[PDB]
Write a protein that binds this DNA or RNA. Structure first.
Length: 58
DNA sequence: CCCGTCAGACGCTGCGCCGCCGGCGGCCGGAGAATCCCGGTGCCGAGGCCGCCCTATTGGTCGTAGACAGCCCCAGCACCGCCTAAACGCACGTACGCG
């Protein structure tokens, strides 16, 4: 069930299980209204050599 | 004709080859998670300094440990012979041990 990303909006709600990204089984993008503390956002892709291999989580 | 002997082909048996698969082993890349420095910052406490006095040093003594000078004599050391128990060598083997 691959779902197209949708910007979840949480003006006062937390990034709860009601989060559209959460229910969509997908990470919250930086375009989402989930704050800079949302735990569903991607962490940052710090693969030193090249972000290109099996060790690269990305 | 079929049997009999030998011969030749078949079937069966045993083998290796062959391809596949697996497992293994090795080696490595590189994330990443700590540790490791490296530099900036600020104390507080060495360390440093001063006042002072109580103890360390000085002079004298005197009397006694202790040297030392001498000495006797035990007993530690040699050694000597005869003895045998005690030591030694080996002979198994099974049982602790080590994996």
């Amino acid at each position: 069930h691959v779902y197209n990303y949708q910007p979840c909006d949480h003006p006062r709600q937390p990034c709860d299980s009601s989060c559209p990204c959460v229910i969509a089984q997908n990470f919250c993008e930086k375009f989402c209204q989930c704050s800079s503390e949302c735990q569903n956002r991607f962490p940052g892709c710090r693969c030193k050599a090249q972000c290109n291999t099996k060790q690269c989580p990305c």
